[PDB]
Design a protein around this ligand. Structure first.
Ligand SMILES: O=C(O)[C@@H](O)[C@H](O)[C@H](O)COP(=O)(O)O
Ligand SMILES: O=C(O)[C@@H](O)[C@H](O)[C@H](O)COP(=O)(O)O
Lengths: 554, 554
């Protein structure tokens, strides 16, 4: 009811229904000669630049204006201050949403129920700084008096994607640091394949769980612990090999970790927003706390930009609006994120949890059901691999797929006088050019004529070689991929997802769909036990259980 | 015109428009008490079993019948014999489509323009067998007289996904084998990060390119070669460190590889179907040729099943039809593949190229444009990670997402008396149960009542905790994930994609969208050279190039 009842919203509907044909990229580029200048945003962090080029979008000035009007009218600005001021905008859980307090480099007091949270934030941070320095330097020794050579993080979901994504991306900054491993799936393979190369004497396990009760997280933790005690044999040896990142002390303690080894965070830190908290121990540990501090700073700059810049020229805002355009008006079910950077190979996946767990909702603030589309399906792989993979569909399939193209201008490995990056750049420029302009029948006919074939031959080939084009894209180009910028990049999308939720009137910070999967299987577990058949379910679920049992013996 | 002009097709349209409401999973399970038995397929390869359970689909008997009728009427059966008999069904390129000849364990003669191809297939295979045996045993020595410890594959796309996906999946079978590395992206990082750990003395590079002219493949090849010759210094040393998998001998030769070191394949082997050919050297090499031979056999069994089993009970066929149902009638843009197996973590990605590069077309056999949907968007990550990630949207978002659930019954690492796999099973059973049945307002209300809250409290929470359900899924359960079964699994989907193309009347075996990206960037490359600004493009493309140049100096 909310969105579709909106005057500016309804106004867009009619213009769209009315001009859709007027929306051709090719022609739009004839019309305005500095289209580029009008649909581009240059941000300078003073530690590098980020160019947000949104010109190849089926969009005009009036549309942009109308889209800004929509955001204004739906409370984006004040929704935003509520977030920063520590109010509880997580309305179903009745929580504050304060990932931004975690990178609040200025230590401005942010209060929750009166109490400033910053002193707690900085405290856990200093604990992180010293723990890092001790482990990285070799002072912190293992049970046989050895130095740590491997750090092993155990957790899943929020406690998983961040650290991995970032470590994979900040690889170059890790020479002086110990190796990280990430075990997340319950699948015994995951834990089995890691330990069988580790030496317990120089290994360190981090149990990352906000509630410290996640099934798969906790049983991996125990399997690890059993493997460890076979060699150590002394229970107190545990204190030098296991640390925890949770909110529940009691549980931390019932698991046997020393309370001096617990690095805490708060219920106001959402899982899919926690890399900035204690959850990031693994990053700082592998890449140095200094660079971690730099990650947090980058996100701090963008937080500042989001909060104080007017909507017409506000990166996160723009990005959210161009998306609502594609989702609620053109109808596109997905959105591809395509980083032209091998280090960022898990970036897309991260936002899958990022965007999708946040915005795949259907109930309103009013308790009403949505009667419009919400969060899209987000996918991708780094380029140029993608091009040799699924681009054929983006170019000539029967569905529209808006895409984000990302790339750094300076590569961390300028081998062969920068020839490699050169080719990676050219490819990053032309796919979007081509996705724009396409190729008409005539264009291809002439080309065939030139290849010297003859119209009777190429009569049947021709159509297959035609490209319609007019497919939209964003291009995101930044100076170099360092901790700072990467901080700013993630924080950017974070805010994008936020503005959209506000406009769709949903809660971007709970995840009952997720909370439920965490209970759902509790009844199936004991039933698998015997070799006797189950009947307590649907014929499918039962059919399946029974195939399993008969088979496990095969 | 083809599909939408079809009598059986048009007949489905009306039934659908007519019964859509009749389609509720929950109720459908009350109705038929052995729904399971009627919508399930048990295949026994004699080297294990695969259960295809398609009962949790919004489908009935009449629909299934009508769907089979559609396939029959559109030439699925004979399209199929054309493929096996070596006719050129790749109509735009005028090629035969014979990936099935590669695993033709029975050496039945399959002719292309009169000549049986099998003798060539088996030849390259024996070359593979001996090369493997020599490298694996240590007889094949490097330039300083050392044994090979690392194999490095270089290629992208078809020449990339297969080998990687399979090696990651057949991990356990690799103890006796050397490590494999896969370098594919042009991004200098990719090649830089691999070599800086390798020793040239014991390393072997495989240049996998069908045309042997792929830009990124060839410049990685040269960068590798330069790195190699710094140490070896003798050009003939190359012959013991570089092998090639191509169709173009000349080019192979102009690159400096010894013709005795070239393992060839044929233009009738499509890139996204080539893991079964010489392209698989890397698998056999890492996992033993015996297991490779077993992979090929598994695919051979399924080829046999596809070809001789009637449509109503033909796995690939069923799978294709349930998809056309969701795509052309319900309207779903994507399809998720969700393997509950960590080893299969690149499986989904593989089919992205698999399905999408094959079926993201829009021109017909008649040269007509489609006026209906084609290949979907395929995505996924292994479970249960996914559940802690994007399942929230699958459960409570505003779009329908059919899903394939896959799992082996026996795990390769039955640690802790098989507790791990046990929990992984229970989770694999309940997500689909839950995606089916959901949870009504009453159900959740009662639950809240029980948690002892009070209706005024939970009045506003309630709706957010409701699940509509009625979301469809396939469950694919196999005995164990071995080479054989994995062979059969891949081959299964391969045929699925095939049947769909036939029904949509498109060419599943060319990829001009891809062929073009391979030319598109040739003009941008030289322009990046100076520090002088470009003007020869759209204001966007130019704007971008110029930001780049000014920046690269920053
Ligand atoms: O986003 C979420 O809430 C989930 O992905 C959590 O990250 C995951 O379930 C782990 O929860 P915990 O941190 O309590 O172990
Ligand atoms: O599917 C395709 O055709 C592409 O993915 C190719 O795999 C890729 O371009 C590599 O081609 P080549 O084998 O000629 O180097």
């Amino acid at each position: 009811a909310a969105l579709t009842q909106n005057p500016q919203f309804k106004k867009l509907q009619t213009w769209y229904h009315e001009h859709r044909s007027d929306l051709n990229l090719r022609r739009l580029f004839e019309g305005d000669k500095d289209r580029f200048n009008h649909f581009s945003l240059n941000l300078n962090t003073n530690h590098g630049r980020i160019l947000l080029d949104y010109s190849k979008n089926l969009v005009t000035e009036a549309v942009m204006q109308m889209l800004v009007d929509l955001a204004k009218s739906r409370g984006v600005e004040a929704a935003r201050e509520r977030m920063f001021n520590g109010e509880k905008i997580n309305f179903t859980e009745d929580r504050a949403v304060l990932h931004v307090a975690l990178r609040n480099r200025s230590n401005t007091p942010i209060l929750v129920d009166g109490k400033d949270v910053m002193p707690e934030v900085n405290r856990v941070l200093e604990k992180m700084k010293s723990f890092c320095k001790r482990v990285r330097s070799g002072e912190w020794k293992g049970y046989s008096g050895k130095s740590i050579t491997d750090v092993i993080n155990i957790g899943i979901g929020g406690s998983d994607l961040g650290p991995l994504m970032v470590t994979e991306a900040l690889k170059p900054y890790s020479a002086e640091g110990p190796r990280v491993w990430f075990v997340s799936n319950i699948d015994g393979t995951h834990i089995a394949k890691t330990l069988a190369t580790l030496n317990p004497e120089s290994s360190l396990f981090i149990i990352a769980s906000k509630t410290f009760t996640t099934q798969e997280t906790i049983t991996n933790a125990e399997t690890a612990k059993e493997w460890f005690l076979q060699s150590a044999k002394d229970p107190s040896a545990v204190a030098k090999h296991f640390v925890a990142l949770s909110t529940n002390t009691t549980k931390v303690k019932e698991f046997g970790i020393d309370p001096q080894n617990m690095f805490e965070f708060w219920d106001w830190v959402g899982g899919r927003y926690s890399l900035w908290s204690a959850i990031g121990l693994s990053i700082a540990l592998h890449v140095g706390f200094d660079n971690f501090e730099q990650l947090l700073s980058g996100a701090h700059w963008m937080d500042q930009h989001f909060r104080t810049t007017p909507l017409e020229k506000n990166a996160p805002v723009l990005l959210a609006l161009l998306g609502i355009w594609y989702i609620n008006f053109f109808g596109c079910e997905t959105h591809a994120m395509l980083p032209y950077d091998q280090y960022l190979h898990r970036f897309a996946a991260y936002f899958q949890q990022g965007d999708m767990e946040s915005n795949g909702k259907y109930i309103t603030k009013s308790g009403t059901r949505v009667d419009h589309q919400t969060g899209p399906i987000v996918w991708g792989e780094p380029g140029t691999n993608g091009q040799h993979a699924f681009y054929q569909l983006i170019h000539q399939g029967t569905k529209m797929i808006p895409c984000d193209f990302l790339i750094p201008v300076q590569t961390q490995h300028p081998i062969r006088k920068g020839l490699h990056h050169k080719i990676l750049l050219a490819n990053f420029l032309a796919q979007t050019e081509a996705l724009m302009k396409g190729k008409s029948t005539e264009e291809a006919r002439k080309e065939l004529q030139a290849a010297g074939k003859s119209p009777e031959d190429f009569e049947k080939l021709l159509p297959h070689k035609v490209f319609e084009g007019n497919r939209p894209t964003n291009s995101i180009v930044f100076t170099k991929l360092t901790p700072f910028i990467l901080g700013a990049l993630i924080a950017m999308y974070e805010h994008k997802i936020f503005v959209q939720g506000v406009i769709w009137d949903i809660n971007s910070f709970d995840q009952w769909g997720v909370e439920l999967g965490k209970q759902l299987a509790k009844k199936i577990e004991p039933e698998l036990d015997g070799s006797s058949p189950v009947t307590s379910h649907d014929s499918s679920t039962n059919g399946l259980i029974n195939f399993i049992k008969q088979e496990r013996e095969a």
